[PDB]
Design a binder for this molecule. Structure first.
Ligand SMILES: C[S@@+](CC[C@H](N)C(=O)[O-])C[C@H]1O[C@@H](n2cnc3c(N)ncnc32)[C@H](O)[C@@H]1O
Ligand SMILES: Cn1c(=O)c2[nH]cnc2n(C)c1=O
Ligand code: NA
Ligand code: NA
Ligand SMILES: [Zn+2]
Ligand SMILES: [Zn+2]
Lengths: 115, 300
């Protein structure tokens, strides 16, 4: 009944003032994309930065098993769009937020389905 | 001049035709660094400019394209160049990368080990290598052709690059191999390309465009490296990041180039012509299957 809770450890580390994980791979792009959260190619809009997905995944970067029961990664091999205001901590952003399954935008950072 | 707006500079043809002796590389702007866009890694900028230049060549871009990327790890434990390659290549392109040391990657599959351990059942449409050992750079010793991973790369191209495919292999003043230059004469066209963001380095990418599987031209690789250094020594390149701000036409166009499985007896001049124009890839279209040899040791 024991498994390491990496997400809680990183969140707690952040809340106590630890420096965000760095060397997330930021892509060059036009910043005229759809703004969707996780895409097959960089899709940042003017308010976002696009990053290589694997470098923004806590589980990839920490060399640990993904919580997906089959060990699949939501980010590796794709590009993740991070609001520019949060681009200092892309790993923390992807960990703490969820993608709208309807529109593909980040809940609270693009998804307007609740309008 | 207007070169500052290009992604980089390719070796002018007249330099390729010289018969120079090898000298030390002495760059006017040695030690200068380009100012990169905020938060952008050198190797993202470098691979972006490489891909921007590759867009100007007659690359074969088939459906079911397969690309292999050697030396893809970084001292950061991530793979910036792989991320750029995957951005550039058409969606669905099979991308394999590899490096000596463990790293986290966006490639479809990653092999960790010496490149000499890497084997593939299939042939490849594009081979990219950023392999480099800084211990080759020794300005106090003679600068001879290097073997090591260059020996592997030469054999790998000849055995596993599809006809019509292309390569980009990183070299420097001291990290180079004469047979690899000789092998550039087995492509329809070739060059040495210097990225504008890294213009103050003797680095270049040695690009072979459209593999013909036989010599189109006999190149002496010792002389050709001397020609490359002579070019670098007499042509300062202004550091520039300008092309990074223009990504509107970055993605490689899915040309849908034909793939055919042909036997050696069937490759006539008309086929060679098609290969030379980026209009044909010759290989099987089977499954992509890779492996890495593992040396087993019991130290008990
Ligand atoms: C300039 S770095 C790679 C930078 C990387 N392309 C990037 O996108 O940041 C040189 C790479 O070549 C690798 N390399 C050098 N010799 C190698 C060998 N014999 N086999 C496999 N990889 C090698 C190094 O481990 C090292 O990671
Ligand atoms: C390219 N290059 C140079 O241009 C240079 N100039 C002085 N040292 C130098 N070194 C070590 C070098 O590698
Ligand atoms: Na190709
Ligand atoms: Na070197
Ligand atoms: Zn992951
Ligand atoms: Zn929504």
């Amino acid at each position: 009944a024991f498994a390491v809770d990496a997400a809680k450890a990183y969140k707690d580390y952040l809340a106590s003032g630890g420096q965000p994980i760095t060397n997330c791979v930021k892509m060059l792009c036009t910043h005229t994309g759809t703004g969707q959260a996780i895409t097959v190619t960089p899709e940042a809009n003017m308010d976002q930065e696009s990053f290589g997905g694997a470098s923004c995944c806590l589980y990839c970067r920490c060399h640990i098993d993904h919580p997906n029961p089959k060990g699949f990664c939501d980010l590796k091999g794709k590009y993740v769009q991070i609001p520019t205001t949060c681009a200092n901590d892309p790993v923390g952003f992807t960990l703490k937020n969820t993608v709208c399954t309807v529109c593909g935008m980040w809940k609270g950072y693009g998804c307007s389905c609740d309008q | 001049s207007s070169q500052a707006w290009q992604p980089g500079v390719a070796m002018p043809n007249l330099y390729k035709m010289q018969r120079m002796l090898l000298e030390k590389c002495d760059l006017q702007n040695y030690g200068d660094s380009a100012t990169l866009p905020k938060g952008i890694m050198m190797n993202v900028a470098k691979y972006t400019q490489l891909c921007q230049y590759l867009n100007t060549l007659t690359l074969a871009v088939p459906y079911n394209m397969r690309v292999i990327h050697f030396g893809a790890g970084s001292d950061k434990g991530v793979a910036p160049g792989t991320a750029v390659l995957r951005q550039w290549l058409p969606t669905g392109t099979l991308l394999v990368d590899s490096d000596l040391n463990d790293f986290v990657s966006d490639a479809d599959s990653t092999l960790i080990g010496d490149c000499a351990t890497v084997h593939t059942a299939n042939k490849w449409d594009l081979i990219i290598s950023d392999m480099y050992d800084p211990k080759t750079k020794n300005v106090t010793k003679e600068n001879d052709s290097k073997e090591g991973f260059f020996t592997y790369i030469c054999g790998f191209i000849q055995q596993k690059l599809a006809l019509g495919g292309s390569v980009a292999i990183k070299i420097t003043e001291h990290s180079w191999n004469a047979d690899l230059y000789k092998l550039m004469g087995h492509f329809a066209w070739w060059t040495a390309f210097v990225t504008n963001v890294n213009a103050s380095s003797s680095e270049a990418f040695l690009i072979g465009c459209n593999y013909l599987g036989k010599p189109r031209e006999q190149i002496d690789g010792y002389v050709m490296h001397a020609n490359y250094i002579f070019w670098r020594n007499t042509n300062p390149i202004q550091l520039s990041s300008y092309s990074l701000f223009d990504m509107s036409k970055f993605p490689l166009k899915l040309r849908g180039t034909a793939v055919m499985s042909l036997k050696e007896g069937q490759i006539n001049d008309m086929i060679l012509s098609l290969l030379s124009k980026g209009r044909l890839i010759i290989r099987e279209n089977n499954r992509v299957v890779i492996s890495s040899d593992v040396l087993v040791n019991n130290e008990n």
